[PDB]
Amino acid sequence: FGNSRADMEASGGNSFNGKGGANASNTFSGTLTVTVDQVLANGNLHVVGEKQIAINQG
Amino acid sequence: FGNSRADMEASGGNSFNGKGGANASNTFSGTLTVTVDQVLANGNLHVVGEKQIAINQG
Predict the structure, then answer these.
(1) How far apart are CA A40 and CA B46, in angstroms?
(2) How far is A47 from chain B (nearest CA, A)?
(3) How far is it between the farthest Cα atoms of chain B?
(4) Which residues on chain B are in Cβ contact (under 8 Å) with A53?
(5) Number of residue pairs across A and B with CB atoms under 8 Å?
(6) Angular region, B37: left φ>0, alpha ψ -120 to 50, beta rest
(7) CA distance A42 to chain B (A)
(8) In 3D, which of A40, A58, A13 has the Cα closest to residue B8?
(9) CA trace torsion B24, B29, B31, B34 (10° rounding)
(10) Which residue in A16, A12, A14 sits closest to B1, CA to CA?
């Protein structure tokens, strides 16, 4: 053990941090009058409708 | 392990942040008297109307 033959010192480190995420949203509010353009075999009604508003510059 | 033969140190990073959105709105308030210009086969009435106001400079 003389002459620092067995003296030793070591250190080590390892680090990892990952993360992730996502999100989506949508809202819609209004009222629209549509018209029936087809009646299906079970009585369900296909409906289509369009509202066009022009206010000033569009 | 002498002469720093195995000593090492590394670092790394990766980042990403995306986002997006949209929104639309419209309001309309008023009163208008229109005229029936057609009666459909089911009794529904096609209506058209126009109001013209001139105040000072337009």
Answers:
(1) 26
(2) 17
(3) 100
(4) 26, 28
(5) 4
(6) alpha
(7) 22
(8) A13
(9) 0
(10) A12
